[PDB]
Nucleic acid binder design. Structure first.
Length: 51
DNA sequence: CAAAGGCCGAGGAATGCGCCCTTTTAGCCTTCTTTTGTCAATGGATTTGTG
């Protein structure tokens, strides 16, 4: 929901794409950073988790 | 006039999961100035030598 608020703040309909097609990016990024930041007890940085 | 079936939705495992790029932040790594511990001199005030 936080990520979706962020995407809603950035949506421009001048292009004509669906809102889903844009906001899905910010939503999935928000959720992924959330899991990578606050899911392990010992916090691994995000790039190391990608590795 | 009902039945089969095509459709949609409400609910779950999981073989499920970002990338490329800019920008700050930590920390290690060298270089230098200063406080500190050390070696040698160099007299100088008790300790002993003397009769």
């Amino acid at each position: 929901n936080i990520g979706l608020m962020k995407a809603v703040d950035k949506f421009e309909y001048r292009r004509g794409y669906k809102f889903s097609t844009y906001a899905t990016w910010w939503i999935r990024q928000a959720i992924t950073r959330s899991i990578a930041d606050q899911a392990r007890t010992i916090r691994i940085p995000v790039h190391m988790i990608e590795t």
